[model samples]
Target: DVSGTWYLKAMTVNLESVTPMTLTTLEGGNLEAKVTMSGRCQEVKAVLEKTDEPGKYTADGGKHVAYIIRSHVKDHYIFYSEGEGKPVRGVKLVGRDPKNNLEALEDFEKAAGARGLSTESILIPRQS
Candidate 1:
């Protein structure tokens, strides 16, 4: 798991939205995420429980598996999540300013492609 500040850069789906996220890594690979959403700008928090599989995590009491696909410490992170027969997704994030990371974006393409997903499937959200 990862800790510290992270900004969503790109994803297999359109984000269409806010603030950065806080990923707090606890003991035994467990994690908690604080993300802002909604009109009030409040945090929608969740505890990501570590699972038996490497890089896989369960949230909302074993409802979904938020699997960690890749990471480069404070540099970048990528993950895929699915559960309850919902639409699986891929997302990548970075620590620094949300631009000027061509290599990371390209890396996300490769990672997404490796999992049989199309590079065209990933949507780069408007960083404006």
Candidate 2:
């Protein structure tokens, strides 16, 4: 389960600058994310659904905004989004796992490398 916090490095269409995003996987399979781009912040919320295929999760917020989260390799998961959205416009987010394993990071890096993407880390705040 990705029931924790994950950092986001957005690769939207035609966007050169990188926007920082913080995603929180809440209880009962909901997602709340904060995206900061160009010094502006936006809040996005989505409902998560497990797809029929293994290692695939779908997130739907509304019209023109949807995301597909798939387990790429081992502990690394790839976040793919589409539609005309503010924070992310057809962006790809690749990152490591919860445990911060070197192998996991390598797996993510490899997956990102295959698509010429980069990997980064984000600290998820601990639930009190």
Please name the candidate that would achieve the greatest TM-score relative to the true structure.
1
* Per-prediction TM-score: 0.75, 0.41
Candidate 1's error at 67, in angstroms? 1.7
Which stretches of model 2 miss by more than 4 angstroms?
5-20, 36-61, 85-91, 97-128
How big is the positional error of residue 105 in model 1, measured in Å on the Cα after superposition?
Answer: 2.0
Instruction: Tell me the lDDT of model 2 at 16.
Output: 25
Question: What is the overall TM-score of model 1 with all chains considered together?
Answer: 0.75
Candidate 1 C-alpha lDDT tens digits along 17-68: 3437778988767888887763575778888998888888888677777877
Worst 10 residues of 2 by lDDT: 119-128
Off by over 4 Å in 1: 14-19, 71-74, 96-100, 126-128
